[PDB]
Structure 1
């Protein structure tokens, strides 16, 4: 004939962290940290990502002969590439504002490649001979697909007067470049003009380029360099090209038809024919936990990243 008071006790071994007492056993606890992932590249909201098979962003945009599976790409949710892609600027050189271009490409989900300047628009230059062995195809000298290396034709190189309306309703990404020779004889043997220039003029861009004919060291077997440049042409805006030589004329531009959100992700994981809301270079979080500790860089619906190995919130009473 007596009443009594106590609390619920179970046989679980859940443990929580308290600043004054470690390793406290509780009856019920809620885990708020996610430490598991599928381990494979997985689709983002049902959209297949752009997976560069050992290829770089610049190589894909410039039309690397090896990276020819990206000639026509569908809409993508994010761009994923290896940390050190082997196929990247097969011809030695650099891409100006390459990091800025990658930042700009981080918010583009689709490109519609168009032939702004056809190969028939150069009747007085040579489109056929611009082939290198630093850019080989099926073991034959070849060169980047999306730009044209113009060579002197019939021992002449007339000045280029090329203009192009942006009659489209979307921004156009135009890629051109300049070739730096090695010596004076190479310059006259391939361009016929000792002193050349490249002037590009838009509403906001006023650029003039002069090749640097110097002596450098062999990169990919070539002591020559090619510096590439890019611009974003606004609708109803014209772009003008005037060149005396050393011109890598653009051939294909890119329409920015869809402009959402994305990331450029560095991971060597393989595709898994999957479907996830949040992606990770390590894997994919298939959970709705408050926190996770897989990787700081995460795209999609992603839980918060913390550097803690465990995070358990006590819910029940002490288990004793």
Structure 2
């Protein structure tokens, strides 16, 4: 009688890849892959997650909070992760802005990038004493404050030149914007200007013709020139009809460096100013953030880590994540297919 050694034979539907034997059929396999499913976004496990610049500033958008619109002010808390919900962010009121004529729209998404943000205290410059003659400070309905009644953006002062007096047109006046923030913070300065009816222009300031403006901060120079006649229909504004409009821009000032603005009649000189440091890891999501997830995928939203790798649409993802793979992969758990004998 003979006694030999042998291996099993069974149903072997699963296929695996091998350098020496080529592609073989195998008893069993342990899959390492998953194709996750699109779900809503959520709160990243270990970490702060910032959706809205300040929550608790109700009926305020992030642009609103950024521009310092009256009644939108509050603690903007800090996060190591932020979600970018508005690709083209909007104002929810105050005075009509011509948004699209400057980069101003992205200001919130910029602030978002940082871990730590904070409106300043005081003012980076005294508007009333600025160059060009004493200024009364302008306010407008559509910008109500804690009380109610005429106000403006915290972020800037509307320099109207006092009263009849020396009111007239000037050549460009130049102004330095002091640093004002601490340590290693970036200082983001918000500023701009205002135009009106041809007759209203001569009523307000001394001048009918257009006025011209310049910002310079550490290598980055920009230039603007005003519109006199009819503007675009008002939009994203506070709702009261006005004949004039407003252009708003921001300028970033590096860590320590000062900045410059040149202007003629109608200038909005910056007052309160953004102070930012640290950095937050931003992804493209869409509120609300529901629950917790291990992972936040730009395509798939919330995700929980199941198998080490996944197949599917690849994009930016933060948190404890499975790794993206070209093909669904199998680890072999079993034997090579053996025909019975």
Shift of 1:184: 0.8
Q: What is the TM-score of this pair, normalised by structure 1?
A: 0.72
Distance in 2, matches of 1:120 and 1:190, equals 20
SS in structure 2 opposite 1:46?
Answer: coil
Deviations 1:126-157 (A, max 9, x none): 33x42243x56688665433222333432465
Distance in 2, matches of 1:15 and 1:189, equals 84
Matches within 5 A, 1:89-108: 91-94=96-99, 96-98=102-104, 105=111, 107-108=113-114
Q: Residue 163 of structure 1 contacts residue 240 of structure 1 at CA under 8 Å; is this kept in 2?
A: yes
Matches within 5 A, 1:1-320: 3=4, 5-7=6-8, 27-36=28-37, 39-43=40-44, 45-52=46-53, 57-65=62-70, 68=72, 71-76=74-79, 77-82=81-86, 87=91, 91-94=96-99, 96-98=102-104, 105=111, 107-115=113-121, 117=123, 121-122=127-128, 124-127=134-137, 129-133=138-142, 142-155=151-164, 162-166=175-179, 168-170=182-184, 171-181=186-196, 183-195=197-209, 196-220=211-235, 221=241, 224-258=244-278, 260-263=279-282, 265-272=284-291, 274=292, 276=294, 278=296, 280=298, 282-287=300-305, 289-291=308-310, 293=312, 296-305=315-324, 311-317=328-334
Distance in 1, matches of 2:233 and 2:290, equals 36
Shift of 1:227: 2.4
SS in structure 1 opposite 2:65?
Answer: helix
Specify the alignment match of 1:21 in structure 2: none
| Structure-2 change in CA distance of 1:118 and 1:203 (3 Å) | closer
SS in structure 1 opposite 2:200?
Answer: helix
SS in structure 1 opposite 2:99?
Answer: strand
Q: What is the TM-score of this pair, normalised by structure 2?
A: 0.68
Distance in 2, matches of 1:238 and 1:86, equals 29
* More strand as a share of residues: 1
Deviations 1:168-211 (A, max 9, x none): 43321111112232x21121233343343334344534444331
| Structure-2 change in CA distance of 1:247 and 1:283 (3 Å) | same
SS in structure 1 opposite 2:303?
Answer: coil
Distance in 2, matches of 1:212 and 1:254, equals 28
Gaps of 5+ in 2: 18-24, 236-240
| Structure-2 change in CA distance of 1:40 and 1:206 (3 Å) | closer
Between the two proteins, the alignment pairs up a number of residues equal to: 304
Distance in 1, matches of 2:283 and 2:266, equals 32
Gaps of 5+ in 1: 19-23
